[PDB]
Amino acid sequence: AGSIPGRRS
Amino acid sequence: AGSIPGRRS
Amino acid sequence: AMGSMERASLIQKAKLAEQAERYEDMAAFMKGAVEKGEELSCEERNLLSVAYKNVVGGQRAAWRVLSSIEQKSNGPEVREYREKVETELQGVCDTVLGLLDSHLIKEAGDAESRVFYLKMKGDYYRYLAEVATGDDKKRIIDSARSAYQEAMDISKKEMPPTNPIRLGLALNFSVFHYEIANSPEEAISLAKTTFDEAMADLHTLSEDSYKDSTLIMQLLRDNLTLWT
Amino acid sequence: AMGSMERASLIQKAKLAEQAERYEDMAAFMKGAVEKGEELSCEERNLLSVAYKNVVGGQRAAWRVLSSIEQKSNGPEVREYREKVETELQGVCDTVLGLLDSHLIKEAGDAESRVFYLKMKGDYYRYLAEVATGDDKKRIIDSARSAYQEAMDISKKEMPPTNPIRLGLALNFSVFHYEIANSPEEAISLAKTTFDEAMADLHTLSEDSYKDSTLIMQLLRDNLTLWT
Numbered sequence A, B: 001a002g003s004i005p006g007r008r009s
Numbered sequence C, D: 001a002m003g004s005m006e007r008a009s010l011i012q013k014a015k016l017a018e019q020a021e022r023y024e025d026m027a028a029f030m031k032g033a034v035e036k037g038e039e040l041s042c043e044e045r046n047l048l049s050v051a052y053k054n055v056v057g058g059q060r061a062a063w064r065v066l067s068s069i070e071q072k073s074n075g076p077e078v079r080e081y082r083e084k085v086e087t088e089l090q091g092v093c094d095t096v097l098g099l100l101d102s103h104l105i106k107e108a109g110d111a112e113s114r115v116f117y118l119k120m121k122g123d124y125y126r127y128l129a130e131v132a133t134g135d136d137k138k139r140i141i142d143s144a145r146s147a148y149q150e151a152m153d154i155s156k157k158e159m160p161p162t163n164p165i166r167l168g169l170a171l172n173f174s175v176f177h178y179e180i181a182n183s184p185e186e187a188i189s190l191a192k193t194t195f196d197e198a199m200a201d202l203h204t205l206s207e208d209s210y211k212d213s214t215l216i217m218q219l220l221r222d223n224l225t226l227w228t
């Protein structure tokens, strides 16, 4: 189950 | 130009 | 620690640190920028979130590796080292929550900033809950739920159903329901309703906004595929 | 810093840190293990080298990103941040060189340990030379060359031409010639001679040793392909 991939920008 | 990839083990 | 550096220089260095994949530096620069006391622009909020999500993301991955080894073993070394990583992770989460409480949330009046910060507050309590054990877990879980719920209430009143912040908040709250609160049916219902209401609003969007909204909508679909 | 932890516990935690991809921790555990004052086994030498190569490898990648931005710009922020990363990298290299000098090399009497440590000494002076400017560069370059040369002299006398340490030393010394010393012809000649002498010795090897030697031999070939 994936959360927001907020690792870029 | 690549040196030894000694990043594992 | 960053008190002698200009706000604008801290922001510039945070962007450089992102390019160099130096996320601990990036987070330290953005902590210094927050502690200047001014509100953050949209781009600056993204820099703060990206920095800490990368730092805590590495800690979470390491904690999971060590926790798996520790469970497969049940000397003190594995537990000791898992505990060390866990304390470091808790310290980073506490730092982020401290920035949100002093004083980002209380000064955030526009929906886009307030929803963003409350989503962050839910996320970092969620990361705390992933490693918490017992009744401590209960209050931590309620803190995550309460932050996500306030963000949801604002987002439903103030943002269109395709807004990327609204969509990402719903995605992460659905993961909270599934993975933390043991509420898989609530997770599925929230993801489905969010996806369906966004679909019905896509006709209003430009090409660029359509790309952003449909990308996150696919993340909702990916979770629904795994959960059903 | 690790003085109160058992040597065996530091080694165990270094292995856990490798599994968790926590290379800074891994390097700190292995520094503590070296500072116990006992010689290192083959496996322990590998843990020390892997830890620091990962730490300095991340620093080198970041320094290259920042140096590229800095050159493309020619405010003070990019130079300031490149300098910060550079000083951190130099500090890690100095720490490794300090461990080799106090007292790993002087106690290393077998060819496999002494060649290994001298190759490391060449490598960390090489990383220092990558960021050095001027006549400082000259003495740093000579220090790398001298360490590699002593390692080469021992390896040619004491190890077969397929020995993986001997092969990796020759590979890295050839890179030193090509990238640092501005001696591409020496780099090519060393790589070719190393490859050819290893090929002629493969018939003596078991299946497992053959796999190890041919893998490194392919790295020599890959460089020769790029250089010719």
Ligand SMILES: *Cc1ccc(-n2c(Cl)nc3cc(OC)ccc32)cc1
Binding pocket: A004, A005, A006, C119, C164, C165, C167, C168, C169, C212, C216
């Ligand atoms: C928590 C969170 C929600 C959404 C996003 N996100 C993503 Cl992924 N892509 C985006 C594009 C945007 O353009 C305005 C805004 C937000 C976006 C990240 C994090």
Ligand SMILES: *Cc1ccc(-n2c(Cl)nc3cc(OC)ccc32)cc1
Binding pocket: B004, B005, B006, D119, D164, D165, D167, D168, D169, D212, D216
């Ligand atoms: C500096 C250096 C040289 C060789 C190696 N290396 C590699 Cl790659 N694979 C190896 C297998 C070995 O088995 C005994 C020994 C050394 C090996 C790493 C680093």
Ligand SMILES: [Cl-]
Binding pocket: C185
């Ligand atoms: Cl059901």
Ligand SMILES: [Cl-]
Binding pocket: D185
């Ligand atoms: Cl020539």
